[PDB]
Design a protein around this ligand. Sequence first.
Ligand SMILES: [Mg+2]
Ligand SMILES: [Mg+2]
Ligand SMILES: [Zn+2]
Lengths: 64, 135, 39, 193, 140, 322, 103
Amino acid sequence: DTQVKLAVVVKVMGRTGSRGQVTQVRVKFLDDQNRLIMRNVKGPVREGDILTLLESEREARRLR
Amino acid sequence: TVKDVNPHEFVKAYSAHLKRSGKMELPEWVDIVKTARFKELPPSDADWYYIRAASMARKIYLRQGIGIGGFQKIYGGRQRNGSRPPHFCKSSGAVSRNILQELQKMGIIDVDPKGGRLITSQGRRDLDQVAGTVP
Amino acid sequence: SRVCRVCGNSHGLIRKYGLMCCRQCFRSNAKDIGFIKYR
Amino acid sequence: PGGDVKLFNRWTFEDVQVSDISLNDYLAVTSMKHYTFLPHSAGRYSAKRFRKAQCPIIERLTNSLMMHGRNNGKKIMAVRIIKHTMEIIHLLTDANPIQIIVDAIINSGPREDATRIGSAGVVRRQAVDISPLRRVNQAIYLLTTGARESAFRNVKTIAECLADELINAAKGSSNSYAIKKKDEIERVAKANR
Amino acid sequence: PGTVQCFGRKKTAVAVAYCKPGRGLIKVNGAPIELIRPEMLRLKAFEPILLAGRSRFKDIDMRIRVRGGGKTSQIYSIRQAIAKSLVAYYQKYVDEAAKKEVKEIFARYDRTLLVADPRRCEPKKFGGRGARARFQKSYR
Amino acid sequence: ESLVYAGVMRGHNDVVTAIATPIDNSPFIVSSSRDKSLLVWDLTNPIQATQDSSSEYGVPFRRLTGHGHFVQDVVLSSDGQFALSGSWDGELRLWDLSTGVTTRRFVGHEKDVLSVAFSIDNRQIVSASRDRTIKLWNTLGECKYTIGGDLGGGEGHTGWVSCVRFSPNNFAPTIVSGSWDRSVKVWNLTNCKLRCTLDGHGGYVSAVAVSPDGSLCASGGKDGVTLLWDLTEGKRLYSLDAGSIINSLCFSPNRYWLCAATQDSIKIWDLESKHIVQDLRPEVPVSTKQMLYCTCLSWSADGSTLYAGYTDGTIRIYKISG
Amino acid sequence: VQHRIRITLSSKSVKNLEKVCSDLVKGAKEKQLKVKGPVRMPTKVLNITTRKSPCGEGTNTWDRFEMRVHKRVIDLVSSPDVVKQITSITIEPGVEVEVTISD
RNA sequence: UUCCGUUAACGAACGAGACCUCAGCCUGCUAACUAGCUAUGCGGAGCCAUCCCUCCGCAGCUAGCUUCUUAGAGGGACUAUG
Ligand SMILES: [Mg+2]
Ligand SMILES: [Mg+2]
Ligand SMILES: [Zn+2]
């Protein structure tokens, strides 16, 4: 099974996608405040938003 | 007085007044006329003349010197032209004139020099009397 | 039965305000008459 | 919680609890600055990014009712609709209808989506996260669209259709349009994870 | 001596509140403020009175003449009329500190009970029926 | 002993440009600002030692709004309530502090006005201006004379006038004017001629002072060098050195002290000993960019308290010890 | 001996009108007359919108032409000869002077 | 092609900008019976009724009237301050 994990956008990196509709941010896990990983988010997002992750493992790559 | 009562319940109260307060004549076309060129059916309520009277003596009581070609604009509205755009249309002058003439033939209003129609002192009196009796 | 005062043409006539000029003669003489292009 | 200003002078804004810490900053019911008598404030939002995170949720929901052209601009009707929806909601759950609305908004927001991005040289659709603000945006979109689609060609009034939609989404029961759409978007997203 | 006459403005509607030292009276165009009649936006006209309290109005009568605009714009103009009129009354007759009080209660709830909207209706430009919209374009 | 600190009051949004205090109606301070208001403060003298020594020296009482631009200088009536204020809109106004309404209005200064001052009989009113002219007004706000013009027209300055004050000697009324042309003049109300030209500073002048007994003529300004002069006949006694710009100057009512606002702190010299004995710093030293100057100062009637109005609409009050 | 004289001024140019309008008021201020003015009436903007093109081809573009007309009124109490003495000074081009007598 | 700056270029001309119109703020100025608000008088109508109180009408040598309306002169914003 999977458990929904909760993360915080700590810095926002850029705008990926063909049409720039996706942002790339670095998130930080609230339970383990040592695991910082890259994710892609759809929709407006600033520094400090809390992102819900259905799975935690998937980690984006630079300029994905 | 009249401005301290909601104008819907007041018109209901007054249109019940003219009913049980004696009488007035009523034309022999009241059941068939539409009250406006743009209307589809005659007024739905059989007691509409009195409503149209009670709503209308409040117009002269809050204003002064209103003719008939102004009441037609008061009670006019939107006319839909089928496939063409809708516009603004005026109501019928016959009912507008006849209700004022009847208010004259009861002494609620009177015709005004300089043109128009004005509320009478006694017509002011009963309107504030009935206003005193609305919840 | 209604022509341009400047050229006697029958189309695009401006009768507003009493001008009675056609839409092209009025443009050629607008500044002289006193019609300014502000906005 | 000394805040005695109440919606329509009926519904207390005290004791509304937002459970999701994720969207707690993007639902405007918890702080005193966001309490209102009425959901019709001629607010100058949309002027800046993230301003509408401050717009009261009840106003956002009301704003999303005035849709499909023959209803554009008709805000007083939508405010009356929300009033009756709320009276019905408390005439069903006997609970603070703000809490029911907020629970429905939280429960009806998708957390994943699948879009066509370009990886290493070839474009194809991958799954992505949803920001909290777009979660709230989509939640209101889904609930309002579901209610409007129920009310069309039906003797049920849009107020009652909306109330049923909101109570069902607050329950989380998979019978409202909002929940089924949420789960279908998230399934299309999972399939391409 | 208390009398101030303060206005409030919206799209085109303007309201003007004249103040006397009376008892509790608030009348818009001669009718009680209880009866401003789009009733869905009725708590909007009452926003200031419940924001301050009827008690803050125990010694003034307000005659508010409103004009122009439409129904919603007049309601918002009246809102601004009560708010700025109260601020001016406490400015000129009561106290400088207890007008700062009421100013802060009024301006923590909404900044446009005291500041009017500079938003106006943008003019229309040829090539479409609207400020921004254009006629639908066809190629073939 | 020395000056001590009690608190700071905040009633003006923009830079405070003048304070005036009464002698007969004591607990009524009035201060002007760049906000077109004109605030009047009431003094029960509270120090709320309940919330970290809660900071307020008093409670604002009344704003005289009505000027169309920055109010530059204000003064009070020497016998009653009235106040007179000058502003950038080219006007002078007479306010009545018992009701908060204006009572008179001195129209006629063709350009901006920078200084106002009353008189003993309160019939002799002076206005200094960016017009590069001085004008004398009666209590009725109508004209009787206007000194100015270029060399041919008369002896008026060529830059803007920046400040004017009276000589408080009763057998010889005069008026001293500091200018942006780097020149101080002394005039007479008898003939509106000049007694003397007190040719001093090398930079523009922004301040002139007359002794409470009318004996010596402190003037400050651009260079940071203050020059004291002789009221009897135009003689430069000695020079003092502040360093930075100078805006406001004042004398203690009875004690022999001269105070100055010099853009990094308030500097009080002594005239008993021509040497500084008191510097006064802003309480809050936050590292924001160049800190609030003090823009204006005034003593009370008894000299028991000095008021300083700064560039942030903050006014900090200074008492004495014993 | 004193009438109610109304002098009405119309123009297309604000400044040329206001120069004459101030001149009349001051010329009647030296005679210690009662001058109730100047009264300003709503500017009348005569507007004509015309197609730029003479031939109806291309983008349909319009130009809006406008004449602003300004209407001042001055009120006086005098005899018509004193006013005719006053309204005889040099008048700028484009200004209408149409003195009458009100009731 | 706005500017800083770099620099076999130096110094200039147009276009952009500036500019003009409208809208947005001004209880500050000038006023206004072809705009009005305020108070007072008389007139009506209500009413603890006699006054007071409320709502309209009407007339003026009421205004230390111009807030609302109109239109002129200006002011205001410069990214000014952090
Ligand atoms: Mg239609
Ligand atoms: Mg239906
Ligand atoms: Zn032609």
